[PDB]
Structures are given as structure tokens and as C-alpha cells.
Design brief:
The structure is a homotetramer.
Chain A: E1 8-15, H1 21-30, E2 56-57, H2 58-65, H3 75-88, E3 92-96, H4 99-114, E4 124-127, H5 132-140, E5 144-147, H6 168-178, E6 183-189, H7 202-215, E7 218-222, H8 226-236, H9 245-252, E8 258-262, E9 273-277, H10 281-294, H11 305-317, H12 321-340, E10 353-357, H13 358-361, H14 371-383, E11 388-390, H15 392-395, E12 411-415, H16 423-434, E13 446-450, E14 461-464
Parallel strand pairs in A: 4-5, 4-6, 6-7, 7-8
Antiparallel strand pairs in A: 3-9, 8-9, 10-12, 11-12, 13-14
Helix pairs in contact in A: 1-14, 2-11, 3-11, 4-5, 4-10, 8-9, 12-16
The structure holds ligand A1ABZ (2 copies), ligand A1ACN (2 copies) and potassium ion (2 copies).
The site of one ligand A1ABZ has 19 residues of chain B, from helix 4 and helix 5.
């Protein structure tokens, strides 16, 4: 394990505290054994998400202070437009309040666009892996969300450079089975969140885009963690060994027609999202027509002016290789601590989180009893650290059959907010999980009490078995 | 006209400037003669809206700096929950990113809830006046938005205390015509924005709510300007002469079952919204399940923690009567200057804006050519002040006939952000509009070039009829 | 009277409240009938000073957030150095924590420098008018503070363009009487605070400086209100009718060798000061050696880095002519409201405050009895407004005689902070003072219960008669 | 070496960068081989001082935003007064712009007060150790600054619990030698900055006060690092094992009549100072009379209202034991990395810095050549770390025998990963220790040379 030094120093701090063991026992109980329902006061180190919990820079705060709050035509809207043209070469932007607002703007518009000439009667979206909000917006619009990530993502312990890659073979099979007229769009998720924050390679992105253009399919880059994906392409693809991060990013976006971004991830924000469209002005115009009732006027999209200002500055800071080397180096430090102590993880670690393979850590719990959640619950009761489950619990149920979607991966996700926690905080997280060495086989799964029909993991209430 | 002094002093400023006439003329053509498409840099004083442009206090900024950005369980969510219980006596909250996010959470839930028990077969919503994003969500979900504001709202020059009131006769007639089963909800808009920011009386709120419960109809308080409405109740209803503003608000919300709020108006914020539900936990649970895919997790709802913290403090500051007296007195001062000069306005002025009656100011322009928009564009080329149209352009086409919804009133809305402009800014606005007294005749209407199907006035480009 | 619109809009507000007459009377007695000893909570509109009470711009706050707090070599120290070269053409700067800190750094250095040559056996300083802390530092260093303002300043109701001017005949008289070897420095105070914020003409500054060089005498510009002085030069001097404000300022500082500045005035700050020296490197070095024990290291001078950053920005905003036009016009609006009702004021109004002539308003109270302080107290009891005395109270006793210095003016100063109050606040002040027309003849002065030996008006406790 | 986790998380960051080795030698050249003349843009990790470079909390920045900027009677002045009464039990406050502003207010007043009845004809001040600005103000007013730290502070490698103590024997001897009428005040400096940030025990503070009160001598507590001292007392005095940090502090200030404070240290500020007086109203009145010409009006003292607001909150946060344990543990972690690798340091480490003895690292450079400055320059050229010299360059040649480079650590600014960068730089200098040459004056000022002198390597 190698500690990589921060390429910054601290300017402002926020207190944290360890709640007592009896606080955590009561809190988890009151929260229905779902840490999503805990108050933050009951949490020590929060590893629930890397979304919106990032520490901004003094430059981002100063940009907020001078942000233009004008309802129409904010100065910051035009800076954000130029920045998106600078980084992605995309000519149209619509701000959104966060990533699932961008998906609510774009995905219904793509469906209606595809349904011209009476096509897309049995419509589907195709992705390496639809994350939860993305798949929910696909299915809420009456489509199937099809995930075709490479099967090397399924062998946790075996190294591979690109575990977020599309399976090109399955992509061709799905185009053959469904037909190009049913494929509303392809979604390239960079990095692949559900596979473990694992990068998609540039040739993979290129190859998927070639096939899509052959068949007239629209391609959307789910871009929440694009800077982490660009760093991995520079690190693992020899063809980009001497490229700047921005140069890799520019090339990534030659292989999509539009993007949906949660700016709460790699742009280092606490709120914000973005739709950018390359050159298709009709899809842009239709999305603007949906933005107005759902999000806001097309020059702020449900954001305050200051948050567009912070996003402009965040989009620059998130591409800095010195910062990305440290950020992804910190994730790698935590993974190497756990791996050295015999804890199975998705290897190599991805950009934003260590994914602990609980299918190997707790074999006595079947996947539909949520094994990673039993581990998460025990880790919290022992340490005050709050983690999150990326497995059968999050995967949910098939819209058609109403049964559990089969999960090939049962991950506990230790999600690391950017520039928030030190490597000493990582050591606490590592030692806490390692201290559970003798209790893993003792753990038992969980059973529902209240299950939402959609995105159930957020508010479900569980009971032990 | 009477000038009322600020109950505050200035702690931070932001420069503004006056574009040259050369820039304004050019900027308007580049904007398609739709001021909504002007860059803010081309605007001197911005009267487009009172939404999200407000100046916050130092205490509001301090609340932001210590805001808790946690994804789940932010301390500011629990503060917001207690604050809603304090102000409205409502036990459930869901934050939203702004008012139309709150509408998108709640209104589809209310429809499906009634549909699930075999009702709402031909569904309608009824309001004193649905505002545009509110009506847009009604229509997007397959329902009809019915507006029944008192006819006194159309008698602009004649003073009345409660020009936002429901027409009670018309409420009962619609309930009989459509049936209670088909009425998804009644929406009480306070103040009534479309009628000129005009207040709804307490006794009108109470009668509407009592009729609603007799028929099992859910009532939603559209609450963006609830503090301005409450100030008017204290000012004009003798029963509330000696009540506090909070006591007036507490009584107002006895006459609804839920609220949707744009916290960008009276809570004095730059972003933010809220759903609050009095005590219907099933509606609450259904609203939360829609919040998650559309807005965000149920304890931040598409807001930053710092914005929930700012809302908690702003909800307090927006009820302060010395602030409300000053704010509404500034709007009144602007209207008095215009009304002194013969310009017809909705009288008395409402809480957030002066509404100029352009059907009385420029009779030569027909309603479907948007006479208020012609006056707005001339005021911009003359002064750099950007105003907004509240008439046919905003009312739009009927989603069933595809033709112009008949506009009983053509208003140019001079909308005043809270604590942003001084009374000397008000004098500049009034002097410029009075300065167009000789050119109101020679003003002609406008036609469409690109018309959106929903909420057309925003991105539409207009062609001068000449 | 003419109301001039703010060339800004409001971005942040701070509550104020009117204390009840009962609280006012209790607080005034507890403060020893000296409003300097009132807590701010007992004050509605504060007109005690225009020092450190200004409202900053969003850009000033954005500069604070990114300020460099380094102990040595702050980025903002160098930016401030560059700003002084641009504005004043001066080559050396020493930041100070405020104006009297600048005077403490520089005045002892100028005296020892004059003595090292063998001179200064009976040392004096000469100014159009030394303000209080300036004269206190002159006297604390063993020198006499001689004031020779134009006689026009004593003719309060009669208009004159340049009531802050040096009396040229008296300058030569004092140079002949004391000898050039005894004059440590000439202090050009711009605007002349004690004469009523009244401007010094460019031709007067030039003639003073040329007389000073003739005799080898160092010239210091007391520059707390140099931008207001510059606006008056453009407005009233035909030579500069079409010059920019910055061009006026650059010409002003051709007529001095160094400057001491409270940045809490015209650079729109809440704290801060500055020494700038034109080119005399020896004085700069000696002043640096005194900066270290009294203020701090020479690259921050007792300021946080954020306050240097705000000063750079404020130096620029303080010179914008649209702002000065409004600021001075608001002072002029309040003065005109008072003058139209028959209240005698120093006319024309100066840059920062309206000076009410209380020798004429309350002729029954002798000067030694402080008639202006009687009007101030009455105004406060009536309205919550706190004003300050610029007469015999502030002038204090003479170090040699020990008795009251002869006061040629007895003013109540209504001091206006920058960008803080609106013209409706000005109307409130005007109506309050105008409403006291009947009570003016009935007022009675005060006596000393506790008199500090130096700068007695800040902390003295008085008792009516 | 044990790493102690931060009891906080990061809310706002500020970029740092490593300048190239060519920039370092060119900038150190322009700086005249004096690190104080480097711009910050030339410095990677700044270890020059723990004064004014601290990271504030979100609560401190919120307090600034609502700060009352009124000239007279700021809301935050009264808050600060109450906070001094709570923490110290002292009844009178005067804000100052920083520590040496507070000394400029109080020390000339104490001298005039002692002279009131034909006394103090040969006046002196006595301290466990006067810091530089403290000693400079004493001498600028015509007094001698006598330093009488315990002898165990001079044995750098040998542990002792209280290396900042007064030598009680010397205190009684100096009282007898100078007479209690010439002792204007005793200055108890906590922690003892010049001894290495080393604490003063409660019993030492107690006995010193008892002696002074018997002789009618005024006792001033120099309080810049009072919380760090309070932590060491609770950690090393068994009587206080179970006391809170605030209870320790309350007890400390029973043994003084006044305090001067740089709030730029333990109160976690970027600017700010404080005078507080226990109950002597006459000294308070005279101190206010000097505040007005020198600092500002007596309710802000040369501070913005926002900075007084931040001070009130910082005084609370600087007492938090979880934070102090981490803060003093991080300095100790750097010290242990160095001590475990054969680098001589003042042992144990103090509250705010690590002192490295360079006279033993470069046994080729004599005292008349500034060995610690050559190590500092060598450390800056290989890491970008700017440390300060406390040896033959702190000219106030006289004597020295102590050639220490100080590694001063700002509060809540640098991680233990930054500490490792620093330690590995100073340990990685083994290969170039022997080949390091001395430094000569290329340009020397007559006074305060280490602030502005220019040097050049000796060939
Ligand atoms: C009563 C009520 C409102 O007034 C209301 C918003 N009003 C606005 C803002 C904006 C919305 N459409 C417009 N058309 C023309 C000019 C401006 C606007 C206003 O400027 O009037 C909302 C929606 O909340 P939000 O804006 O999503 O947060 C719900 N209900
Ligand atoms: C011309 C000039 C000044 O006006 C000046 C400061 N003036 C002030 C502030 C204050 C000082 N004494 C007062 N007596 C009565 C009322 C207020 C005051 C003002 O309100 O007029 C200074 C000193 O600067 P600082 O305060 O250290 O930053 C130097 N020169
Ligand atoms: C690839 C990709 N696309 C779109 C989005 C949606 O963006 P948004 O609306 O939140 O801005 C995300 C968001 N991910 C975040 C937040 C989150 C959403 N659901 C979750 N379930 C469990 C744990 C966390 C989460 C994260 O994984 O922590 C994303 O990762
Ligand atoms: C015990 C004690 N008393 C008073 C003071 C004065 O407070 P101030 O005016 O700075 O606020 C201090 C301050 N010391 C600081 C800063 C500093 C001043 N001179 C220096 N020379 C070399 C290196 C650093 C410094 C420190 O040691 O780094 C103090 O330590
Ligand atoms: K957040
Ligand atoms: K806004």
C-alpha cells in the first residue's frame, strides 16, 4: 500500500465525531436496518456516496460569490456553454439540477424521437451497465434496460485493465435480437459504476460508437465519472501515455452524440447536472422543451447561478492529473490495505470507491437475502462508517416478471468523496472492516418490511433473519 | 406616492450597468424580440421575475457555509421539517429543487391516487388561477386546468381588497358539472400571481376548503407568495388586525391538505422548493417514491445542503412584518407613480409586482398580437429595463382545440426581486414608462416564428408585425 | 434636492432596528452621555464614522476567499505593490492594519531621519489640517502639529470650490518662522477631514509640493479619502473636466513623496491601511524596520491575507466615477435637505459627511461646553441616529499649555458609510434633525467626569449642565 | 511513529505546487539566500510559522459573515468579553490586531505604572523565556528582558515533562539581584516558544505567581499557545488526568494578573490579538488610553468585526481536546519519524513545531557560518519546504550554542502525508549533508538581519 500526498492543503474544516456503540445500535434499529435512513448525526465517516459530498476549492467558492443569479441569460450559463465546447467539442448545453434531472430531460426525448415513423414499438436502451436512476428512467418510460458489461467484470480477483468495457459480442447479438429500430439509444457509462467504478477503454468506446453509427443508433455518454475514466485511459492505454487528461477527454467524446452528467461527481460539486448535445439541434430543441416544465428555464435548469459558476470552475479542476493521481491513488490505498489482509475486492480498484466482494466474504447468505447489506450493517455497528450496497438490493426487480433481477456481483461499496477524507481516515475504515475477520461467517441476511416498487434500496425497511 | 425606508442596510453589492441604445437594439434582434432570450449582460434593471433573484441576508449566507451536504440525513433536512411543522402545522416534508419540481412530485401522485380507486376518469384541477408551470403539469398528466378567479380581478382600475379570491358560485358549478370524482384537487394560489399578485381572503380560503371536504376533494396550497398573501390578510381583514404574520399563516394552512412551494419567492432564496403534507401519510409515501427518480433522495430533493439551510432561515425572514411592509410598500410606490401619471394598473397593487393593463394602455393592438409584449419591447429599447408579459402569450393555446386560450387580461408585469432594488431604482422604471406616453400609439403587435407546444413564451421568437 | 440612483444592486442585507426611546435614554446615560460608549445594539442608523463600515462588492468577497494567508511573500502583497505603482506611481509599499498604524510606522521614521542630518531641534509638522490620530502621533513623537487650512473653511454657509486648501501665505510664514530644518514633514490631507471633507485643489497641492521641494521638506499625503478628493478635482477644475478619475489621482501624487492611507475609507474596506513611498529607499528601509515590532512582517503589516486581497479590489472600485458620483451625490442630497430647512452646514458638502455648524445652530452653548455634542445627544434621543463631534471635544487640549485648543469650527458630523444606506435612510436622518427646530435654543452643554490625556473624545464620560 | 486521525473532514481546499529545483535556487538567490524573502509562490510546504496560517472551521467562516463591523460597540466585542470571562475568569478585555500589538498596548503601561512612585529606575522584565517581539518591546521601552528557563531545556535529546518551566532558583536570585521595585512584570510564556514549544507545569506557574504576589510583582501570561500548554498539563500532571481542557485553562490563569495573546495561534485565526486583565481597573484604563492612538478604538483594536467574531469561535474550538490530541500528535509524528531515523530533535516535541539541531548534521560548517540556514536552504532546494532558523541568525555574534531549524506546523492545514514528505526530505539529505558548504553575507542590514539579509554560499 502506497500513500500518495495531497496536491492541496486544507483551507476549511468540518467537525466529525464517533457516535457511541449504543447510539449506532439504536440508530440502525430506528432506520429499519437501512443506513440510507440514518441521520448524518449518527454517522462517523460517510462512505454512502461520492455524489455531492465533495470538498470544493477556494476558487469554486469565490466563483459562487460572484455568480449571476439572473433568471434568463445568466453570465455563468454562457461560461458553462463555452467550457462544454472546450472539453467535449459539443455545441449545445442544457443545465440540469443533477444527473437524474438530465436523464429526465434527455431519455423521454430520445424515446419520442425514435418513435417517429412508428419505430421503437418494443423499445430498449443498451448500456455496459445502467446505474439505478438511469435504469429507472428507462423503465419508467416503458423501455427495457439491457446491461452488457464484459464478463471479466465478474471475476473480482482476476486483474483486467478495462472491467467496464461493453461486451461487443453481446451488443451485436442485442442489435440482432431487438433490431436497430427498437434501440432508442446506447448509454456508455464512464466509469462503469455498477462494475466497480471500472474504466471503459478508448478502443471499446470507439468500437461501440462505430457499430451504433452503422445502424443509426444514438449514443449517450453517462458522464458522471468521466475524468476518472480519462485517467485510466492515460494510465493503461499505451496509445495515450503522453496525452494530457483533456486530450483523452476530447477523444472520449468523439464516440457519443450527447452526454448526461451528474456534476456532483467528477466536477467536484455539491449539486448540479448537465446535458450537452454534440450537433443534433432538433434533439436539443426538444430537450429544451422538456427542461422548462421539469427543471427550469433553459439557462439555469433548476440551478442557482452560483452553482453554474462552481460547475465551470469544477469542470477544470476535475481534469487535473495531479489531483486525479492522488484521488484514485487514495482509493487504491484503501483497496490495497483490505486486499493485503485477505478481504476480497474488485481488483483493480476503480476511480471512486473500493467494492468489497461479499459473495466471497459471506457465503452463507444467498444473494436475494442481500449479503453485502449484512456486512454493511455490521461494519456500521462496529465503527460508525456508513457504506452502501451495489448488489441484488440495488439491482431491484425486473419490470416484466416482477422477480429479483439476477445479480452477478454482490458488492459492498466504500465510496470516497473527493478531497474530503485523509489516508488516516482510510486506515480507520480498513482496520474496522479487518477487525470483522471472525464475524463474517456468523452474519445473516435481511428481509423486507416495506419495499418501494421503484428504486427500492433508498427507502426500504428491512428486518434481520 | 410614499417611500418606505428599508428595515435593513446593505452588506454586499453587485454592479449593474446601462447598455447603450446600440447594444439594446442589436441585442433585441439577436434575441428574436423576446426579452426572455436576452443575455443578462444586455439588461440594466431586471424585472423579468421575482423568482430566485432575491438578495439574502448575512444570516442566510452564514447558514449556507455550515450547511450539511450529506447525501442522506442532512441536519438541515430535519431543521426544514421542524420549520414546516412550526409555520404550517404540517407533519411531512419533501424538499424539491424548485416550485415546478414540487408540482412534478405531487400532482401526478394525486391523480394516480384518485385513479386507483376508480375515480378521475375525466380528471380536472380547479384553481383561483393556475400559474403556467402548474397548469403545464396538469395538462402533461392528461387533466384540464380550470381557473375560476373572481370577476373583480378583471376590473383593473377599481379597488378591491381581495382580487385573488375564488369565485365560489363558479366552484360549485364546476363541481356539479364535472363531478367530485373527476376533481383531482383544488389548488389555492396565494397570492394569486396571474390575477396580479392579488390576495385571497381568509374567509374565501376557508369557504373553498369547507366545500372541498364536503366533496372529498384534496386541496393544495400553491404557496410561493404565502407571506405576501398573509400580509394582506393582516392589513385588510379586520379579524386579523392584531394578529402576527405567523398566526395569519398558521390559520391560512388550516384550509389546505398539502402545499407546493417555490422557495425562490417569499422565502428569499436563489433556488429551492418544498412539498409539505398536513397528515396524509399515504400521499406522503407515494410522493417520496416519485421524488427519488425525479429529484433526488428524500432528505435533499435536488437541493444542496447549503440551500436547505438557507431555506430554513429564509422561511423565518420572509414572515417578518417590517420586511413585508417595506417590500409591498415598494411595489405600491412604483404603482402609485404610474397610476399618478394616468397609466392603468391592476389596483391595488399586489405583493411582488406592478401589473400594467395593456388592454387599456394600447387598445389598437389586438389580444392575439400580444399588446403587452409590444410595450415591454419598447420599454427595453428605451431604458434597458426588461419586463415580462402576463396575458395571451403566457396563457397559450388550448390543449384540446389547439387555439388561443381567451385572455381576459393583458398585463405587462414589472416584477420586483426582494431586497435588491431601491426606491430610486423604482423612480428610474417609472420615469421611463411614463416617457413612452406619446409612443403607445404607433406600437403594433407581434406574431410567432417558432412556437413551442408547452410554455411557449419562454423560447418563442417573435416577428414584428410593424 | 436631487436623488442619484445606486450604480449597483443589493446582493446581501443586514438587519437594523429602531430602539425605543426608553432604551435610548437608558443607553445614553450608561454611556456617560458619550455616544462613543453606546453598544451598537442601541443604535438604529450609525453615522459615527465612514471608517470600516463600508459594504464590499461580491468581487471583494471573492478576493477574500482566495486570499493568501502566507506569513511571508503573500501573493496579495505583490498584487498590492503592483496596484500602488499603477495608481500612484510609487515604488514601495508597507501594508498596515489601518491608518494610524501607517502613521505609527512612518512618522517616527521621518523625525529620526530629519534628526540624523542634525536638524529637527524643535520639530514641527505642517498640514492643511491634521486629523486627530495624525496629530496625536505628531505630538507623541515630540513635535508640534500646525494646521493652516484656508480661511474659506471657517465661512461655513458661503460656497467655495476648495475649502480644504492649504493657506499658501501661512505655509511660507511657518517655514520662515520655524525654519525648514525644523519642519519634519508637510502632510497634505485629501480630502481635508477636519474642514468638513472638503477638497484640496490640484493647483494647491502642486504649489505646496513645489514650495516644499524648494526647502528640502518631505511631503506626506494623508490619503484616506483621495478618491473623493479626485472626484471634486474633475468636477470643479476645468483642466481635468475630461480626465479620468485615475488620471487625476496619478497627477495628485506627483505632489507628494509618500502616503499614509486608511483603506477603511475610500478603498471600501472594513480594515486595512497602507504606507506607500515614491522612491526614497532609505525611508522605506527605516519604515520597514519599525513595521516589524509594531505591525507585523513587512509583507502583511498586521493584516490577514484576505484583507490585502480585498484592498487590491477595493482600490479599483473606489476610483470608479459612476460610484463616486452617486456616493458624493447622496451626501449632497442629505446636506441639501438640511440646508433647505435652514440648518447651517458646511456648504458645499464634502465627500463623506454632512457637517452641521453648531456654533450657529446652538449659539447659547460656549465652545468649551461642546455645543455639537449637545445636538448629537438630542438627535440620538429623538431618532436612534448616532453622529459624532468635530469641534472642541475632538480638538482636545494643547500639550504645551494644557488647556483647550482654540477651535475655529464646532461641527456635528453626519458621517455616511459607502454603499450602506439608501436615500430613504437619508430622508429619515434629515426629517429627524429638521424635526428638532423648536428644541435647539434649549440645549445645554456638558462637563468632564473622566478625561483621557490623549484622544479624550473616544472614551471620556460626560455629565450635562 | 503513530499517525492520529483528524477529528474533522475537509470542507475547502487550496492548491499547493512543488516548484522545480531551478526555481528554488533562482528564487533563493533573489531572496538573498534568506527564506523570509521568498515569495509564497516559490514555497511548496510552508513551515515558516504556525502564526496566521491556520485553517478555520465552517463555523468560524459563518461567524465572520454575520460579524458586526460597527466602529464603536460591535456585538462581537461583547461576545469576546464574555468569552474571556468564561475561559480565563478575567473581567477586562482590549482586542488588538495581533500579539505584538497586544504587547505594545500593555507593556509600556506596566512600566509607567511601576514608575508611579519613584521606582523602576533600572527596570527589567523576567520570563521563562521572552519571545522575540516580547523582548523587543521590553527593550524598546528601556528595560532588560531576563530569560530564566529551566536548565533541562538545554539537554535536547533527554526527555523531561516540563522543559518550559521557570528556574525557580534563578527567579528568586533575580528578584534579590534587581529588587522587586525594578521588576516591572514577570512574563509566563505558555507554551515556551523559544524553548521549543515546551510546556510549563501548573505547579511551576503556581509557585511563580506565589513568589510574585509576595513581592507585589505583576504577572502577565503570554498566551499565544495556551491550549497546547493546557493539553500537556492534562497529559503529564496526574492531578489533572480527569480534568477537562477548560478546567486546566481556568486553573492556569489563576496564576497571572493579565494576559497578552496572539490569537493567530491556538485560537486558530489568520489575524487577531487580545489583552485581558484579571481585575486591575487602573491598568485596564491606562491600557485603553494607549490602544486608541496605536491600534484603534477600544471595542475593535485594529480588527475587523468579522475577525473578532471568528476569535470568539476559535477560542472555543482551540480548547477541544480531540482536536488538541490530534494537533500535538501530528507534530509528535513528524518528530518521531525524524528521531527514529537518527535526526537530533528537541525531545519531547512541543505543541506546534519540531526543532532539528543542525550543528550535529553538518559538522563541516562552524558557528560563524550559519549551519542551520544551510540545512534550511538544502531542505528547500530538494523539497520546497520553507523552514525557519533559530540559531546564530536569530541575532538579538552573541552566543547561541543552539543551532536549530524549526519545522512549524500550522493548525489543521497539512496531513500526515505532508509530514512524511517533510521527514523524508530532511532524512533524504544524508547523502548531501557532508557536501554542504557555508554561507557568507553578500549583503547585511544593520538590524533584524534574518528578515532581509542577502547571503551567498562560501567556496
Ligand atoms: C404561483 C406559482 C409561481 O408563481 C411559480 C413561479 N413563478 C415565476 C417564475 C417563472 C415560472 N414561469 C414563469 N413565466 C413567466 C415569468 C416567470 C416565470 C414568476 O416569475 O412568476 C411557480 C413555479 O415555481 P419555480 O419557478 O419552478 O420555482 C409555481 N407557482
Ligand atoms: C484624515 C484621516 C482620517 O480621517 C483618519 C480616520 N478617521 C476616521 C476614524 C476615527 C479616527 N478618529 C476619529 N475621531 C472621530 C470620529 C471617527 C474617528 C473618521 O471617522 O474620520 C485617520 C486614521 O485612520 P484609522 O482610523 O487608523 O484607519 C487618519 N487620517
Ligand atoms: C453513473 C451514474 N449515472 C447517473 C447518476 C445519477 O446522478 P444524480 O441524479 O445522483 O446526480 C449517478 C449517481 N450516482 C451516485 C448517487 C446515487 C444514485 N443512486 C444510488 N444508489 C446507491 C448509492 C448511491 C447512489 C452514487 O453512485 O453515489 C451515477 O453514478
Ligand atoms: C510566545 C509569543 N508571543 C508573542 C508573539 C507575537 O504574536 P504576533 O504579533 O505574531 O501575533 C508570538 C508570535 N510568534 C510567531 C510569529 C513570529 C513572530 N516573530 C517571528 N520570528 C521568527 C519566526 C516566527 C515569528 C512564531 O513564533 O511563529 C509568540 O510566539
Ligand atoms: K450535497
Ligand atoms: K437564481
Amino acid at each position: 500500500a502506497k500513500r500518495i500526498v495531497e496536491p492541496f492543503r486544507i483551507k476549511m474544516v468540518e467537525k466529525i465525531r464517533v457516535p457511541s456503540r449504543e447510539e449506532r445500535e439504536a440508530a440502525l434499529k430506528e432506520a429499519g436496518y437501512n443506513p440510507f435512513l440514518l441521520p448524518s448525526s449518527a454517522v462517523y465517516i460517510d462512505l454512502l456516496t461520492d455524489s455531492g459530498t465533495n470538498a470544493m476549492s477556494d476558487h469554486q467558492w469565490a466563483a459562487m460569490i460572484t455568480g449571476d443569479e439572473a433568471y434568463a441569460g445568466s453570465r455563468n450559463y454562457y461560461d458553462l456553454k463555452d467550457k462544454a465546447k472546450e472539453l467535449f467539442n459539443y455545441d449545445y448545453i442544457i443545465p440540469a439540477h443533477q444527473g437524474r434531472g438530465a436523464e429526465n430531460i434527455l431519455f423521454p426525448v430520445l424515446l419520442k424521437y425514435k418513435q417517429k415513423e412508428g419505430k421503437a414499438k418494443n423499445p430498449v436502451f443498451i448500456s455496459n451497465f445502467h446505474f439505478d436512476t438511469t435504469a429507472a428512467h428507462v423503465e419508467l418510460n416503458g423501455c427495457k434496460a439491457i446491461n452488457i458489461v464484459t464478463e471479466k467484470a465478474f471475476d473480482s480477483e482476476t486483474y483486467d485493465d478495462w472491467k467496464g468495457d461493453f461486451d461487443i459480442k453481446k451488443l451485436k447479438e442485442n442489435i440482432a435480437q431487438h433490431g436497430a429500430d427498437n434501440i432508442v439509444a446506447i448509454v456508455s457509462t464512464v466509469t462503469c459504476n455498477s462494475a466497480g467504478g471500472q474504466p471503459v477503454s478508448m478502443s471499446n468506446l470507439k468500437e461501440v460508437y462505430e457499430i451504433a453509427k452503422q445502424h443509426g443508433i444514438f449514443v449517450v455518454m453517462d458522464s458522471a465519472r468521466f475524468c476518472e475514466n480519462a485517467y485510466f485511459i492515460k494510465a493503461r492505454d499505451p496509445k495515450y501515455k503522453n496525452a494530457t487528461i483533456k486530450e483523452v477527454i476530447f477523444d472520449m467524446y468523439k464516440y457519443a452524440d450527447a452526454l448526461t452528467m451528474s456534476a456532483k461527481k467528477d466536477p467536484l460539486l455539491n449539486i448540479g447536472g448537465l446535458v450537452a448535445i454534440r450537433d443534433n439541434e432538433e434533439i436539443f430543441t426538444l430537450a429544451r422543451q422538456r427542461c422548462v416544465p421539469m427543471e427550469g428555464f433553459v439557462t439555469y435548469g433548476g440551478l442557482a447561478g452560483r452553482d453554474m459558476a462552481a460547475m465551470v470552475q469544477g469542470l477544470e479542476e476535475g481534469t487535473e492529473e495531479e489531483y486525479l493521481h492522488y484521488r484514485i491513488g487514495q482509493v487504491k490505498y484503501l483497496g490495497d490495505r483490505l486486499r493485503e489482509a485477505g478481504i476480497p475486492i474488485q481488483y483493480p480498484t476503480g476511480g471512486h470507491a473500493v467494492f468489497v466482494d461479499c459473495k466471497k466474504l459471506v457465503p452463507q447468505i444467498p444473494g436475494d437475502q442481500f449479503p453485502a447489506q449484512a456486512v454493511i450493517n455490521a461494519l456500521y455497528l462496529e465503527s460508525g462508517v456508513r457504506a452502501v450496497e451495489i448488489g441484488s438490493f440495488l439491482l431491484g426487480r425486473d419490470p416484466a416478471t416482477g422477480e429479483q433481477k439476477h445479480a452477478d456481483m454482490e458488492f459492498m461499496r466504500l465510496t470516497i468523496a473527493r478531497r474530503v477524507y485523509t489516508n488516516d481516515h482510510m486506515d480507520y475504515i480498513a482496520d474496522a472492516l479487518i477487525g470483522l475477520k471472525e464475524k463474517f461467517a456468523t452474519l445473516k441476511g435481511l428481509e423486507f418490511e416495506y419495499e418501494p416498487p421503484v428504486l427500492r434500496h433508498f427507502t426500504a425497511r428491512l428486518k434481520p433473519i
